[PDB]
Amino acid sequence: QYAPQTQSGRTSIVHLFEWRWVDIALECERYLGPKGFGGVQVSPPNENIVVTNPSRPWWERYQPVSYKLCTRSGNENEFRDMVTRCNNVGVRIYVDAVINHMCGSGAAAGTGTTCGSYCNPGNREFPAVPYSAWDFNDGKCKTASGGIESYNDPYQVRDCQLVGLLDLALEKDYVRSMIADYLNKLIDIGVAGFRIDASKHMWPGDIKAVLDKLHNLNTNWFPAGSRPFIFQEVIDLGGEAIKSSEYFGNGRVTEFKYGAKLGTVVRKWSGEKMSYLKNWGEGWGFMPSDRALVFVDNHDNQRGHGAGGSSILTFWDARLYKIAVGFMLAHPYGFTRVMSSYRWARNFVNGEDVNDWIGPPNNNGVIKEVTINADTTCGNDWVCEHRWREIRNMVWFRNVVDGQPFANWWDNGSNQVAFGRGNRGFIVFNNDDWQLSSTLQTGLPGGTYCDVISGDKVGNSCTGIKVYVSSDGTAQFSISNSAEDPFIAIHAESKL
Ligand SMILES: OC[C@H]1O[C@H](O[C@H]2[C@H](O)[C@@H](O)[C@@H](O[C@H]3[C@H](O)[C@@H](O)[C@H](O)O[C@@H]3CO)O[C@@H]2CO)[C@H](O)[C@@H](O)[C@@H]1O
Ligand SMILES: OC[C@H]1O[C@H](O[C@H]2[C@H](O)[C@@H](O)[C@@H](O[C@H]3[C@H](O)[C@@H](O)[C@H](O)O[C@@H]3CO)O[C@@H]2CO)[C@H](O)[C@@H](O)[C@@H]1O
Ligand SMILES: OC[C@H]1O[C@H](O[C@H]2[C@H](O)[C@@H](O)[C@H](O)O[C@@H]2CO)[C@H](O)[C@@H](O)[C@@H]1O
Ligand SMILES: [Ca+2]
Ligand SMILES: [Cl-]
């Protein structure tokens, strides 16, 4: 469940948060395929409850009412069309599987749902599944409120309601099977794997029971005997009762310590310095690389009060964000997931964004299409970080150096560091408040390389900075602390 199942050589996936199926299909063909992206994590494709207060927040999609592929992103025909078109150009689709719960227990009964299905939350009725009161954890939960009151008790975290959400009785074969049927339909359609939502709130064994029922991947695009890629979303920053390691037997796990620690370091908070990143990975107390799904930020924490809090770097802090994303994409640790967001009107009161609920760009509830501008950026307030040259080229960098070991590390004892990947790539960073001017061993063959951060290799020339590597592998890197992008990256395919 550990292999990403991306086409050979493609090493990253991108979270196209709240994007509609038709836009993702076009994106695979016009961009993701040609640019070497391994796949796309899509928002929950199953029907959810409509939330009118606030008006259509992004989080209403985490309140399932059925397993019908009918959402604001599109219907079943559009979903299938997207999976087919993306797979046909070598770009995989990974589904955000919301299976720990249904909608809020306080929600009203009716057909105010994304596909018009009926549900009565108060009586635990979800006829479109179908689920009834017998399929929920109400009696199993031992807290007086019926909700999670203490994370120090693994039992209530798994058996009680997460923020009032109706907790599914995952111990039951009926429920496990109902979930497996939904997931298997997705697999047969062409999906390569799943992001298991709120995994921390389910027992590792229950998840395993669901996973054991899954089909092998569709042979139209994958080799026979291929198991779906599984990455479980478990928020574990350490120092708590539930550990990410409890889920290693099911597949990969999201390493939230990654972005929290990296953001703190790049921001230079708590006395942290980039030079400390020499032993990045397990050296920093992280899970094994082969069990990790890493990222700088995700849809939750980019809003400021998730795992990592204010230390999390996002598109709002563009310069430092590109540095953090670049370091991640160059470092061999874990399987990388790049974030792709939309802008919203932030309003911090007492250190917290009260507008963090704002849903995707829309016209009266209808999600806007993703328009592409001549300069390759996006319109309609879709940030499209995955299209920024500095990120796009680092995604390619990761593909180029795939399999090469961490090597030639260098640091100035403060915030200037550098390292390579075997003899195929090298990256240099200056995060200090002064000039970087050093001749370093790159581990690369002599020649002239185009810096893929400031530009690209076009024909027999570079559009940006050029790096002349000596016969002995050394090269001078001069980066001012006032540079827009204080880092340089070169690889085998950027060589003239
Ligand atoms: O009515 C039930 C509750 O609904 C709302 O909770 C939101 C959260 O505020 C929001 O962060 C989001 O949480 C999910 C998160 O995005 C995902 O990464 C994690 O793995 O699982 C979470 C649940 O699936 O969605 C929930 C559900 O809508 C509302 O904020 C709360 O007050 C209500 O009690
Ligand atoms: O190894 C498990 C721990 O790994 C991580 O610790 C980081 C520190 O956060 C970071 O400050 C740094 O520690 C240096 C320390 O600040 C300095 O006084 C000393 O002289 O050198 C230390 C080594 O560079 O590096 C370590 C990792 O090596 C992680 O943050 C922590 O939670 C884990 O327990
Ligand atoms: O590849 C398209 C353009 O991407 C970059 O521009 C980014 C910029 O780096 C980032 O700080 C900002 O937040 O977003 C813009 C794009 O919206 C490159 O710098 C440009 O040269 C590219 O044209
Ligand atoms: Ca649960
Ligand atoms: Cl996540």
From Swiss-Prot:
Keyword field contains Mitochondrion: no
BP-aspect Gene Ontology terms: carbohydrate catabolic process; carbohydrate metabolic process
Domain of life where this protein originates: Eukaryota
GO CC, one annotated term: extracellular space
Principal EC category: hydrolase
Gene Ontology MF, one: alpha-amylase activity
Cofactor note: Binds 1 Ca(2+) ion per subunit. Binds 1 Cl(-) ion per subunit.
CDD domains, A to Z: AmyAc_bac_euk_AmyA
Compartment annotation: Secreted, Extracellular space
Record: glycosylation sites: 412
Binding positions (chloride): 195, 298, 337
Catalytic activity, EC: 3.2.1.1
Site features described as Transition state stabilizer, chain residue numbers: 300
Catalytic residues as annotated in Swiss-Prot or TrEMBL: 197, 233
Alphabetically ordered keywords of this record: Calcium, Carbohydrate metabolism, Chloride, Disulfide bond, Glycoprotein, Glycosidase, Hydrolase, Metal-binding, Pyrrolidone carboxylic acid, Secreted, Signal
Catalysed conversion reaction: Endohydrolysis of (1->4)-alpha-D-glucosidic linkages in polysaccharides containing three or more (1->4)-alpha-linked D-glucose units
InterPro entries on file: A-amylase/branching_C, A-amylase_C, Alpha_amylase, Glyco_hydro_13_cat_dom, Glyco_hydro_b, Glycoside_hydrolase_SF
Disulfide bond positions: 28-86, 70-115, 141-160, 378-384, 450-462
Subunit record text: Binds to the sea anemone inhibitor helianthamide and magnificamide.
Family: Belongs to the glycosyl hydrolase 13 family.
Additional comment: The two forms of this enzyme, I and II, show very similar activities, molecular masses, and compositions and differ only in their isoelectric points. As no evidence for two variants were in the cDNA library of PubMed:10082956, it is most likely that isoform I (PPAI) and isoform II (PPAII) are two forms of the same protein.
Protein name: Pancreatic alpha-amylase
Organism lineage string: Eukaryota, Metazoa, Chordata, Craniata, Vertebrata
